[PDB]
Amino acid sequence: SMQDPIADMLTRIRNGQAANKAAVTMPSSKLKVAIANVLKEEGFIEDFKVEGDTKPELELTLKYFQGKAVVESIQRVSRPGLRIYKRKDELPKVMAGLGIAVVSTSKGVMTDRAARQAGLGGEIICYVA
Amino acid sequence: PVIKVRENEPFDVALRRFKRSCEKAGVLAEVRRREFYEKPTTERKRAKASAVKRHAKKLARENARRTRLY
Amino acid sequence: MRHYEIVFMVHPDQSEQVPGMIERYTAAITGAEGKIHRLEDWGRRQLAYPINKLHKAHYVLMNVEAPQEVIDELETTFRFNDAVIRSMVMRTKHAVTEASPMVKAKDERRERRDDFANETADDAEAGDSEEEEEE
Amino acid sequence: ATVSMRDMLKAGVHFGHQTRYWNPKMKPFIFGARNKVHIINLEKTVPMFNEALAELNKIASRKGKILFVGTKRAASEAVKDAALSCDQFFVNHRWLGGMLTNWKTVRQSIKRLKDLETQSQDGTFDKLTKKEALMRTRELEKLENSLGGIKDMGGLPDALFVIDADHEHIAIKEANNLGIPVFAIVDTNSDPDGVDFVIPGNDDAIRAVTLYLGAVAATVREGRSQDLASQAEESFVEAE
Amino acid sequence: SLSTEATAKIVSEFGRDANDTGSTEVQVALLTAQINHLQGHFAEHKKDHHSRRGLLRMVSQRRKLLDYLKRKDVARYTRLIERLGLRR
Amino acid sequence: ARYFRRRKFCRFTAEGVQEIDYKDIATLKNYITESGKIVPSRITGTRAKYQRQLARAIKRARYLSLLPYTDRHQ
RNA sequence: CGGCCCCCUGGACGAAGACUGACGCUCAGGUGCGAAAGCGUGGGGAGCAAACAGGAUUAGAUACCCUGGUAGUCCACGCCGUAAACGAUGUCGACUUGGAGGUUGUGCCCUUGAGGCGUGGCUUCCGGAGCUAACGCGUUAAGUCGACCGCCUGGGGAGUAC
RNA sequence: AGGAUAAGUGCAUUAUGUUUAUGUGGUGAUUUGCCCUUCUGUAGCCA
């Protein structure tokens, strides 16, 4: 049933910003967090916390400029059954580098600027608009 | 067709308005037309459609005043 | 067990048959660990429209519980009973065996508005006033 | 000060009603229904009305012109009392569609009025047939009732005063496209959305809407009384 | 829906010794008793199609939980299929 | 005071008369014309449960001759 | 899917105690199964009716309209499950301001609107974000997306041919 | 033996509209608009 849980993460962020909501909370994962960490530091989300001893749960706050949204959508590219991989030399350019690609490299999850500065390739996860 | 509901004080003229409440409907109302088994649910059951008219008729008196059309 | 609220009426002249018949039907309910939870006799009453002819019949509300297996044989016997004119039994779901909607009108019948006559003595011999043959 | 909050409650215990419908986007300030009558949440409305009255004080010195809109038959007399003078304009015989966007045409029909009244009282059009004079007398009357308290208004007003949105939604729409700062009192089926300061309220109970209007006018107008004397003294430095 | 007296017999013999109804072995046994009763009905009533929907549910889950039980302990599986006397 | 539970004029503006019982004639006649037939449930302002359950309990009651089945029976 | 009732039995909604622990999603093939009539024989036939006769109608009247009137309609098993197989949504699943109706488990109310609140329910109106060419949808999507299958590539001729 | 009583809001040919055969084709009110409209018009434009 739950066949892509990062599509649900991004869809939770998307309805967050479109319905002008301040926070969005959900079930947590090591992958969800690792994507959210690059998004936090590039300011594509504002901040998050992780809490739940029984099962882990993530709460986050949304991308703004003045207090309502300036980013339209965040969508997944590599997905179930159609994984898309890019080389070090082939790391993407998203809105002429105003936007990020979150790229999971062999050394962990980072943004296209740090994968490039590293000279690593990998899986291109999700792009900003 | 004097209508079975009994008139106050018996007389030669049946008082055909004051008697009817729910008579003919559905049993003898679709007279001399072809009879179906399950059709009545969608042909005849028009209660929802008719409640919206009862609400609009009671609403407009007050609103005609409030718009200042009266 | 499941609860089946049976009410029935009986043809006047033939009412002497039921007082023998009732004591086997109750043994078939308690012999299967069911119960008879009231057994109210209503007296003779006037039918609105005749059922198997004649404008009168004699009323009993038995109020049964029994397992599903047994009531199926017992209902097919009552329906093909010549003494019974009609019976109706209502669904199990959310069913009452106490606190009768007719509780005052049953007492009234018995007290003051009955027949006081031999065919409605028989009806009470199949009623709360049970007289029964030895088995 | 805490007095603004005390006013909001004295007025607010009608709670409106409008049966059980209401409008989902006002929900945070809405308590759950008491037996199929809508009942408002009053505690979350008292901060609002005080914040709006503190902002009113400050625009007194920025403004020349108020336009009181959202009038209706029961509240018109209360709008007459809230303007007090000709730095405050009000419409009380209904707003008309395009009165700010097409102010241009109203100001031409105002020029027709002050003329056709000074002609009437002179005796000037009443000659010939009764028809030619009467079709003018009757129109002069329709105009006079509609325009009498907004007749001197030289241009698009500096702020917008809403006491009820139910039929006058359009006055709020156009004002926002002309870039005018909006001061709203919105009812239970209205939305809080898209204006600069809102008081969440309700449209019923003639005793509530009267108290909302008495309060707005004081903050803007005695800020304004002080402003006018100040302005002469400000202007005179230049000419010195 | 099962008779009370079967449901406790099934609990004593099947699942764990905690005497639960949730574990894979006793749910297989609870479906089987409902299947077994129904195939006895389904000697006739050959146009009874809304109840058949149910037959197919109870069979489909029985296949799945036995497939699960072979994905899990091979001991538990080899006992279960032989203690519950399943198929022909 | 608490727990009064169905004094009078309380739960519903039109009282629920029976639910699924049909043995008293007088609860049943609460919604039955002199023509010998049911008034519609939109007109009565009856609660739906008792009415939906009455459709079985009235067919039952006609079949045990507590009620007229038919116009002919006056 | 509509008289009312019993036997056999499915599927759904609530609630406590409690349990196993992705046992999941979709589905080429597939077996199983009908609104209606069609359809093989048995049972059954009251009424209505394709056909068939005749009237009535009229650019002439097979259509229009009427009267007579059979098979058919009704039950049981059996044969390919046909169409307008639908919210004028493929499936299911995850997420998204709500209010109220229709109506239902259940705690509580002066048990004071088919009522309210508390906490679940389907089902539906209303309208805010998004989406549409337009109607329309709107928390059960036709939004935000997710996976997998079915299927289209101008009309006519042809949903037939093969 | 009615525990069924002129009521239960009791109201609208009880929505459903109720007869009349046909008659060919096309046809109307003006750019060449130029592919172009502006980093001094201005805190040059911009994040």
Coordinates of N, CA, C and O (backbone and C1' of nucleotides) in Angstrom, one line a residue, chain F residues 1-5 7 10-11 13 41-42 45-47 49 52 59-60, chain G residues 2-5 102-105 107-116:
Chain F
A1 N -31.6 19.6 36.6 CA -30.9 18.5 37.4 C -30.6 17.4 36.4 O -31.5 17.1 35.6
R2 N -29.4 16.8 36.6 CA -28.9 15.7 35.8 C -29.8 14.4 35.7 O -30.6 14.2 36.5
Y3 N -29.5 13.7 34.6 CA -30.0 12.4 34.2 C -31.6 12.3 34.1 O -32.1 11.2 34.3
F4 N -32.3 13.4 33.9 CA -33.8 13.4 33.8 C -34.3 12.4 32.7 O -35.2 11.6 33.0
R5 N -33.6 12.3 31.6 CA -33.7 11.3 30.5 C -35.1 11.1 30.0 O -35.7 10.1 30.3
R7 N -38.3 13.3 29.9 CA -39.4 13.8 30.7 C -40.5 14.0 29.7 O -41.4 13.1 29.6
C10 N -38.6 16.6 24.7 CA -37.2 16.6 24.9 C -36.7 15.2 24.3 O -37.4 14.2 24.3
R11 N -35.5 15.3 23.7 CA -35.0 14.6 22.4 C -36.1 14.6 21.3 O -37.2 14.2 21.5
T13 N -38.5 17.2 18.3 CA -39.7 18.0 18.4 C -40.9 17.1 18.2 O -41.9 17.3 18.8
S41 N -42.9 10.5 6.1 CA -42.0 10.8 7.2 C -41.3 12.2 7.2 O -40.9 12.8 8.2
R42 N -41.3 12.8 6.0 CA -41.0 14.3 5.8 C -42.1 15.2 6.4 O -41.7 16.1 7.1
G45 N -42.2 14.6 10.7 CA -41.0 15.0 11.4 C -40.5 14.0 12.4 O -39.8 14.3 13.4
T46 N -41.0 12.8 12.2 CA -40.5 11.5 12.8 C -39.0 11.4 12.5 O -38.4 12.0 11.7
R47 N -38.3 10.6 13.4 CA -36.8 10.2 13.4 C -36.7 8.9 12.6 O -37.5 7.9 12.9
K49 N -34.9 6.2 12.2 CA -34.7 4.8 12.7 C -36.1 4.1 13.0 O -36.4 3.1 12.4
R52 N -38.0 3.6 9.6 CA -37.4 2.6 8.7 C -37.7 1.2 9.2 O -37.9 0.3 8.3
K59 N -46.3 -3.7 8.3 CA -46.6 -4.8 7.4 C -47.0 -6.0 8.2 O -48.0 -6.6 8.1
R60 N -46.1 -6.4 9.2 CA -46.4 -7.3 10.3 C -47.8 -7.1 10.9 O -48.6 -7.9 10.9
Chain G
rG2 P -35.7 -6.6 -5.6 O5' -36.0 -5.5 -4.4 C5' -36.1 -5.9 -3.1 C4' -37.4 -5.4 -2.3 C3' -38.7 -5.4 -3.1 O3' -39.8 -5.8 -2.2 C1' -38.3 -3.3 -2.2
rG3 P -40.5 -7.1 -2.0 O5' -41.2 -6.9 -0.6 C5' -41.9 -5.6 -0.3 C4' -43.1 -5.7 0.7 C3' -42.8 -6.5 1.9 O3' -42.4 -5.5 2.9 C1' -44.7 -7.4 0.9
rC4 P -41.1 -5.7 3.8 O5' -41.6 -6.8 4.9 C5' -42.5 -6.4 5.8 C4' -43.2 -7.6 6.5 C3' -42.2 -8.7 7.0 O3' -41.5 -8.4 8.3 C1' -44.0 -9.6 5.6
rC5 P -39.9 -8.8 8.5 O5' -40.1 -10.3 9.0 C5' -40.7 -10.7 10.2 C4' -41.2 -12.1 10.1 C3' -40.1 -13.2 9.9 O3' -39.5 -13.5 11.1 C1' -41.7 -13.6 8.3
rG102 P -31.5 16.4 8.2 O5' -31.0 15.1 7.3 C5' -31.5 14.9 6.0 C4' -31.0 13.6 5.4 C3' -31.2 12.4 6.3 O3' -32.4 11.8 6.1 C1' -29.1 12.4 5.3
rU103 P -33.1 10.8 7.2 O5' -31.8 9.9 7.8 C5' -31.6 8.6 7.5 C4' -30.2 8.1 8.1 C3' -30.3 7.8 9.6 O3' -30.9 6.5 9.9 C1' -28.4 9.0 9.2
rU104 P -31.1 6.1 11.4 O5' -29.6 5.6 11.9 C5' -29.2 4.2 11.7 C4' -27.8 4.0 12.4 C3' -27.8 4.2 13.9 O3' -28.0 3.1 14.7 C1' -26.0 5.4 12.6
rG105 P -27.9 3.2 16.4 O5' -26.3 3.0 16.8 C5' -25.8 1.7 16.8 C4' -24.4 1.6 17.2 C3' -24.1 1.9 18.6 O3' -24.3 0.7 19.4 C1' -22.5 2.9 17.2
rG107 P -23.8 4.4 26.2 O5' -22.7 5.6 26.5 C5' -21.5 5.3 27.3 C4' -21.0 6.7 27.7 C3' -22.0 7.6 28.4 O3' -22.2 7.4 29.8 C1' -20.8 8.8 26.7
rC108 P -23.8 7.8 30.4 O5' -23.8 9.4 30.2 C5' -22.9 10.3 30.9 C4' -23.0 11.8 30.4 C3' -24.4 12.5 30.4 O3' -25.0 12.8 31.6 C1' -23.2 13.0 28.4
rC109 P -26.6 13.2 31.6 O5' -26.8 14.5 30.8 C5' -26.5 15.9 31.2 C4' -27.0 16.9 30.2 C3' -28.6 16.7 30.2 O3' -29.2 16.8 31.4 C1' -27.9 17.4 28.1
rC110 P -30.7 16.2 31.8 O5' -31.8 17.4 31.3 C5' -31.8 18.6 32.1 C4' -32.9 19.5 31.6 C3' -33.7 19.2 30.3 O3' -34.8 18.4 30.8 C1' -32.9 21.3 30.2
rU111 P -35.5 17.2 29.9 O5' -34.4 16.7 28.9 C5' -33.9 15.4 29.0 C4' -32.7 15.1 28.1 C3' -32.9 15.0 26.6 O3' -32.0 16.0 26.0 C1' -31.6 13.2 27.4
rU112 P -32.5 17.5 25.7 O5' -33.3 17.3 24.3 C5' -33.4 18.3 23.3 C4' -34.7 19.1 23.3 C3' -34.8 20.3 22.4 O3' -35.5 20.0 21.1 C1' -35.8 20.6 24.7
rG113 P -34.6 19.6 19.9 O5' -35.6 19.4 18.6 C5' -35.2 18.7 17.5 C4' -36.1 19.0 16.3 C3' -35.5 18.5 14.9 O3' -36.4 18.3 13.9 C1' -35.4 21.0 15.3
rA114 P -37.2 16.8 13.8 O5' -35.9 15.8 13.4 C5' -35.6 14.6 14.2 C4' -34.5 13.8 13.6 C3' -33.3 14.5 13.3 O3' -32.2 14.2 14.2 C1' -34.5 13.6 11.3
rG115 P -30.8 15.0 14.1 O5' -31.2 16.3 15.0 C5' -31.3 17.5 14.4 C4' -31.0 18.6 15.4 C3' -29.6 18.5 16.0 O3' -28.6 19.1 15.3 C1' -31.4 18.7 17.6
rG116 P -27.0 18.6 15.5 O5' -26.6 19.1 16.9 C5' -26.4 20.6 17.1 C4' -26.0 20.9 18.6 C3' -24.8 20.2 19.0 O3' -23.6 20.9 18.5 C1' -26.3 19.8 20.6

